Amino acid sequence: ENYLNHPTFGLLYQICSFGSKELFATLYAQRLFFLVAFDARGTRFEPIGRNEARMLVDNRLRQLRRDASLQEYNQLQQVFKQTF
Amino acid sequence: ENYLNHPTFGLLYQICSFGDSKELFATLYAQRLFFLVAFDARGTRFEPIGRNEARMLVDNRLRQLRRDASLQEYNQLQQVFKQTFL
Amino acid sequence: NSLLTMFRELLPLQIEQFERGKTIFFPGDPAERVYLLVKGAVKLSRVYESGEEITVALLRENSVFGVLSLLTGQRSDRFYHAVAFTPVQLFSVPIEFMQKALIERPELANVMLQGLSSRILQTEMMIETLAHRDMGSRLVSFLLILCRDFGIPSPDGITIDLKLSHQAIAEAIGSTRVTVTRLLGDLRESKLIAIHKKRITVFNPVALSQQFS
Amino acid sequence: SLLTMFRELGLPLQIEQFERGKTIFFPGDPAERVYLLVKGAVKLSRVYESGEEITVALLRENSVFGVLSLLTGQRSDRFYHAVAFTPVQLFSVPIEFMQKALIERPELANVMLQGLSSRILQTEMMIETLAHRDMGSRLVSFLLILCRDFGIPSPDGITIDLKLSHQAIAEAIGSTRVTVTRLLGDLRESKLIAIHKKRITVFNPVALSQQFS
DNA sequence: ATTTTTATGTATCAGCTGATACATAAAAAT
DNA sequence: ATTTTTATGTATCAGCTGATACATAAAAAT
Ligand SMILES: O=C(O)CCC(=O)C(=O)O
Ligand SMILES: O=C(O)CCC(=O)C(=O)O
């Protein structure tokens, strides 16, 4: 529900926030996954592979589950569930 | 109807043969680009040109053939000229 | 933005302004320049003797075009119709002034290869769209791309920030204007999009993309 | 020249062999290399989970592919199916060993840009073909292109030098195999084409090209 | 502000083409 | 050479969607 636009790539949609570095995926058929850091001196974009972008969210899931709220864990699981 | 295989733009089809032994060739689909081919021993070099520059080149060849050659050769180029530019 | 940074330094270079509808280059022109759209949209189109238009690619900001000039140079003539579909700002460097500047600055050489590579992928992504049999799937596949390129965040959904005439669309997806107005009317009812003032706003574009995975 | 330059990215660089139908890269394989098809043909395709395969482009000799690796880097993953449509011989340089090779020899940097340009246009020519409504016109437009790239001069007409199944074709122009056989038959009786030894042959392709002005 | 030019919504029906199935040939595997 | 997989020829249908016209709204021009 949050969209940022890498200039060569075009619009990207947020998947999860690591904690606040964030992971953004390409809009059409999620072909490329990009790690974005909101540094004060500009946004930075780093592409990563599908297999890898998966485990990175995985860890975040367990962390929402064991330390945080019920709501948030479910929401991320939605995105995860859909994306995979 | 005489063909030549360009590395990049694929098949090219002959338009006419000039007295300099140089020959004018054109792209197979839509006549998008024109080329001047010169056959050196290991040359077979390609020289791209525009349609305007390419028209007049055939134009010269039109006049030469009629005055010093058979009508049919002149007519055969005229066919090509007629179809290719008009 | 490197593309934007590097082009700027080809003394400096001043930016060209094109008014809506005004043509950049026509077919037959000597292709002697390489362009870099900075802002706005550029419609590349094929035009038949019959007078009909086929939209090849609808470019986005930081998109490199006029690619024919890198092959043959100022010798060969255009065959596509480059129109400024939206008020546009762009640069224009002569191929020759470029060819030399590429060898001088090897940092710029790579910047260009990446930009052309996007176009190949973008142009290829278009193929996928038109390659659909179902005009419904095809339209949407197209609308998805527009959100990716010209889309802006709007609360209900992503609104592409451009105005599209039914025909303009019909020309892009290989169909008639009638069917366009027809299909759009279906997507309104299906409550997947919304139209105000010629602005197309999709709801959860993500969901729609999920179809094609 | 693309053939000459690639051979200098090592000390010598070795030529890979690929058998018919053998796949070069598959969707989800990491893209670590830039490739150069030297001999034969290569079919790039989008493959859905439904199993339906959509041909994005059928590359010819001296064509540069793996364009995604240049911008993405090894990290990202392929989204297309690179299949050897015919017996093929190609080169393969890791992009990292290419970017270093670009700045060392900017003359090669120039050669490449031209190569990618051709790709853009060739992929754009495809857009044209699929942009037709009339499946008849679309098939022909496609066949023209085939004559251009894979075609070999034959006395009656240009014969494409490749083995093409009706499905393989149907996958290329965005239609069903049935409609392919159907239409082909129509062009058989109209005596514009001919199929012998499972190889296609158009008659005076130039005349067909004129219809498409 | 009035008019008149362009864009959108709606109506129609005819025909191609996708979907489905089978026959048969050609090819590949065994 | 035997079988069995893949490719091509033909049959059948239903439903888009192209083609044409009209209505209406929106925009541009005056
Ligand atoms: O390169 C040309 O002259 C026509 C096509 C084009 O401009 C492009 O691909 O950007
Ligand atoms: O780069 C890729 O992996 C997919 C597309 C491609 O290979 C190309 O367009 O040449």
Does chain B touch chain A (at least 3 C-beta pairs within 8 Å)?
Answer: no
Residue-by-residue DSSP string for C118-166:
HHHHHHHHHHHHHT-S-HHHHHHHHHHHHHHHHEE--SSSEEESS---H
Domain boundary assignment for chain C: 6-119, 120-213
Residue-by-residue DSSP string for B50-81:
-HHHHHHHHHHHHHHHHHHS-HHHHHHHHHHH
Domain D5-119 falls under CATH 2.60.120.10: yes
Residues carrying CATH 2.30.30.660, chain A: 1-48
Residues carrying CATH 2.30.30.660, chain B: 1-49
D131-CA/E27-C1' distance, Å: 35
Return the residue matching tokens 């299909």: C183
Q: What is the dihedral of CA D118, D120, D126, D132, to 10 degrees?
A: -130
Residue-by-residue DSSP string for D158-202:
-EESS---HHHHHTTTTS-HHHHHHHHHHHHHTTSEEEETTEEEE
Strand partners, B85: none
Residue of A14, A27, A44 to mutate when probing chain C, most C C-beta within 10 A: A27
Distance from CA of B11 to the nearest CA of D (A): 5
Residues carrying CATH 6.10.250.870, chain A: 49-84
Nearest by CB to B51, from C72, C73, C77: name it.
C77
Structure tokens at D29: 């394989």
Query: Is C129 annotated as belonging to a binding site?
Result: no
Rounded CA gap, D119 and B9, in Å? Answer: 10
Distance D80 CA to ligand 2 centre (A): 7
Rounded CA gap, C54 and C40, in Å? Answer: 20
Name the amino acid, one letter, at D109: A
Structure tokens at A14: 């947020």
Method used to solve the structure:
X-ray
Is the separation of the CB atoms in C145 and C209 below 8 Å? no
Does chain C touch chain D (at least 3 C-beta pairs within 8 Å)?
Answer: yes
Rounded CA gap, D193 and D204, in Å? Answer: 9
Q: Is D55 helix (H, G, I), strand (E, B) or coil?
A: strand
Distance C45 CA to ligand 1 centre (A): 10
Phi/psi at D163 (5° precision) = -100, 115
Q: Which CATH class is domain C120-213?
A: mainly alpha
Nearest ligand by distance to the CA of C118: 2
- Domain B1-49 is of which CATH architecture? Roll (2.30)
Phi/psi at D193 (5° precision) = -135, 175
Within 8 A of A45 by CB-CB distance, chain D residues are none
Distance from CA of B35 to the nearest CA of C (A): 9
Rounded CA gap, D171 and D24, in Å? Answer: 19
Rounded CA gap, D95 and D104, in Å? Answer: 14
Q: Which candidate, C66, C12, C10, places its Cα nearest to that of C34?
A: C66
Index of the ligand 1 atom closest to the CA of residue C123? 9
Specify the nucleotide whose C1' lies closest to residue D179 (CA). Answer: E17
Query: The CATH number of B50-86 is which of 3.40.50.720, 6.10.250.870, 3.40.630.30, 2.70.180.20?
Result: 6.10.250.870
- Domain C6-119 is of which CATH architecture? Sandwich (2.60)
- Of C78, C79, C90, C98, the residue with max ligand 1 atoms within 8 A of its CB, to mutate for a pocket test, comes to C78
Within 8 A of A82 by CB-CB distance, chain C residues are 206, 210
What is the CB < 6 Å shell around ligand 1?
A: C 31, 44, 65-68, 78, 80; D 120, 124
This PDB structure is determined at a resolution in Å of 3.8
Q: Taking the CB of residue C100, how many other CB atoms lie within 10 A of it? A: 11
Q: Is A44 helix (H, G, I), strand (E, B) or coil?
A: strand
Counting Cα atoms < 13 Å in the Cβ hemisphere of D190 gives 13
Residue-by-residue DSSP string for C77-124:
B--SEEEESSSEEEEEEEHHHHHHHHHH-HHHHHHHHHHHHHHHHHHH
Query: How many cross-chain Cβ pairs, A to D, lie less than 8 Å apart?
Result: 21
Query: Are residues A51 and D77, on separate chains, in Cβ contact within 8 Å?
Result: yes
Domain A1-48 falls under CATH 2.30.30.660: yes
Distance C125 CA to ligand 2 centre (A): 11
C182-CA/E9-C1' distance, Å: 9
Residue D53: Cβ-neighbour burial (10 angstroms; 0-12, 13-18, 19+): middle
- Domain A49-84 is of which CATH architecture? Helix non-globular (6.10)
Handedness of CA B75, D204, D132, C56 (dihedral sign): negative
Strand order across the D159-160 sheet: D151-152, D159-160, D199-202, D193-196
Index of the ligand 1 atom closest to the CA of residue C80? 4
Residue D199: Cβ-neighbour burial (10 angstroms; 0-12, 13-18, 19+): middle
Residues carrying CATH 6.10.250.870, chain B: 50-86
Is the separation of the CB atoms in C18 and C24 below 8 Å? yes
